[PDB]
């Protein structure tokens, strides 16, 4: 019944970068192919006098063979034609870090409690997404509250992805 077409996705109405700014803890996260990110994940969200939104985030990764690292990477973000919807360039401050560039999307937050984030990799052939991830942020790092918890499962239903979270643990790894 349900719509999963990525292009039927609702983000954020009138999204707003400055109000955005400041440290998201990582609650939970849906993988995709090939994950990175595995804990102790924070975002810090900063804007310039330009306008132009960027991001830095340090979180446990595990190279293969079970090596850990912790991971310090780095954001930026290219507007689009819809405010809550971008493109993210990112890499590593260690030149083997994972990089690349992906669609950034604020689907939800209301900036002082909880944030949903979306990314569509790569779509299938009838619109769904065939390799997404996405994280939910949290303002404080002991959780959300119910009512934003209640809000943000319903989001996670509307992207199709309500099944496949996992809670991120932060116990000072990095
Ligand atoms: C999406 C991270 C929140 C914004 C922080 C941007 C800092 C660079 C983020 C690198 C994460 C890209 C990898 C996400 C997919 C994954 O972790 O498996
Ligand atoms: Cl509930
Ligand atoms: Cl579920």
Known sequence: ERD??????RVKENFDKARFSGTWYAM?????????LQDNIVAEFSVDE?????ATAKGRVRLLNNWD???????????TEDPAKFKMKYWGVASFLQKGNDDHWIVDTD????????????????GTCADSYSFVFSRDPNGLPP??????????????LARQYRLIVHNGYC
């Not at 999963?4 to 996705?9: A, I, K, M, Q, T």
């Not at 330009?50 to 960027?54: L, R, V």
Request: proline content about 2%.
């Open 50 to 54: 330009t306008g132009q939104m960027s």
């Open 147 to 160: 009512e934003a918890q209640k809000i943000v499962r319903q989001r996670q239903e509307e992207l199709c």
């Open 69 to 79: 690292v912790c991971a310090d990477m780095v954001g930026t973000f290219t507007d």
């Open 111 to 126: 900036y002082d409690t909880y944030a949903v984030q979306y990314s569509c990799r790569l779509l299938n052939l009838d």
């Open 4 to 9: 999963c077409r990525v292009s039927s996705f």
């Open 28 to 36: 939970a996260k849906k993988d995709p192919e090939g994950l990175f």
